[PDB]
Amino acid sequence: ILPDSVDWREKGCVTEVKYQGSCGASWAFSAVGALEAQLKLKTGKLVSLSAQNLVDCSTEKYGNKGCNGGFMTTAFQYIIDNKGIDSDASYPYKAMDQKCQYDSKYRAATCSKYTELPYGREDVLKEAVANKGPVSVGVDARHPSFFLYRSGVYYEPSCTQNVNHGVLVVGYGDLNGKEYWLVKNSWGHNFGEEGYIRMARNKGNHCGIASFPSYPEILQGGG
Ligand SMILES: CS(=O)(=O)N1CCc2c(c(-c3ccc(Cl)c(C#Cc4ccc5c(c4)CN[C@H](C(=O)N4CCCCC4)C5)c3)nn2CCCN2CCOCC2)C1
């Protein structure tokens, strides 16, 4: 059923790693990264979507606080409510709160709905990553080892299932045995392995990677 390893970069479904700088917008980058994959899947076009759009426009109605943090799930809801999100090129990232400047002329994607996965279920997360696409997740990124990660599979004994940082699961596999989740971060290419971190998989919901997963969908009609 499920492949032993998945890497959605292999299908050209993952945009370049972004750099959030001095702005707590990991939640926005995680959300656009998940939708970028669906847009390529459904239309063949890979285009970076506007995290700034979310920072500026998905605000108090969505419990989001711009550069002070927010949630992928309600980011998706904003995109649904708004009937669109702009391309990154048309609405570029400035790493600060701005007035909402959404322009339907430059809408690059929509969202029909989003699905939240059950808490801590790494088997269900694996199936979604394999069968649906990259999944937005929160992790516990509070511990210094996360900041210093360079290579290998990340395991932090002090990690908890309480999450405060948004990332994108773009695959999974095993490094010489050691099972991992392939995680796209938004701290630029100088973080980890060219912007990516392999996070311990199947170790009791390590760092909360499976605590609050979600993914959006762009539906093609229905029956
Ligand atoms: C405690 S819990 O784990 O139990 N859990 C509690 C329940 C929960 C959590 C997450 C979740 C899932 C995924 C992510 Cl990614 C995040 C997050 C986050 C986040 C992202 C960024 C920042 C902060 C937090 C905190 N501030 C940071 C900041 O300001 N910075 C400025 C200085 C430099 C950068 C940092 C930025 C949170 N979903 N749900 C379920 C839906 C919760 N409903 C969502 C709609 O509304 C009402 C609440 C957290």
Place of tokens 């090129």: 89
**Structural contact between residues 180 and 206, judged by C-beta atoms closer than 8 angstroms:** no
Q: Among 129, 62, 66, which residue's Cα sits nearest to residue 96?
A: 66
* Ligand 1 near 71 CB (within 6 A): yes
Q: At what resolution in Å was this solved?
A: 2.0
CATH of domain 1-223: 3.90.70.10
219/222 Cα distance (integer angstroms): 7
Residues 189, 27 contacting (CB under 8 angstroms): no
**Nearest atom of ligand 1 to the alpha carbon of 166:** 15
| Residue nearest atom 45 of ligand 1, based on CA coordinates | 63
The CA angle 6-112-11, to the nearest 5 degrees, is 25
Question: Any idea where the domains of the chain sit in the sequence?
Answer: 1-223
What's CA 70's distance to the chain center, in Å?
12
Burial 22-39 (b: 16+ CB within 10 A, else e): ebbbbbbbbbbbbbbbbb
Q: How far is 33 from 22, CA to CA, in rounded Å?
A: 19
Distance CA 195, CA 188 (A): 6
Give the list of residues 6+ apart from residue 114 with CB closer than 8 angstroms, or none: 73, 76, 77, 80, 214, 215, 216, 217
DSSP strand pairing (178-184 vs 107-109): unpaired
Q: Which amino acid type is present at position 135?
A: V
Q: What are the backbone angles phi and psi of residue 108, rounded to the nearest 5°?
A: -105, -20
In whole angstroms, give the CA distance from residue 168 to residue 165.
Answer: 10
Beta bridge partners of 187: 19
Radius of gyration of the chain (CA): 16
Q: How far is CA 220 from CA 2, 36, 39, 156, 217, in A?
A: 24, 16, 12, 41, 9
Give residues with Cβ within 8 angstroms of 195, minimum separation 6.
17, 184, 185, 186, 187, 188, 189
d(CA 111, CA 131): 18
Q: Where are the beta strands (DSSP E) in the chain?
A: 6-7, 85-86, 107-109, 113-116, 135-139, 153-154, 165-175, 178-184, 196-200, 214-217
Q: Which of 19, 23, 27, 187 to mutate to test the pocket of ligand 1 (most atoms within 8 A of CB)?
A: 27
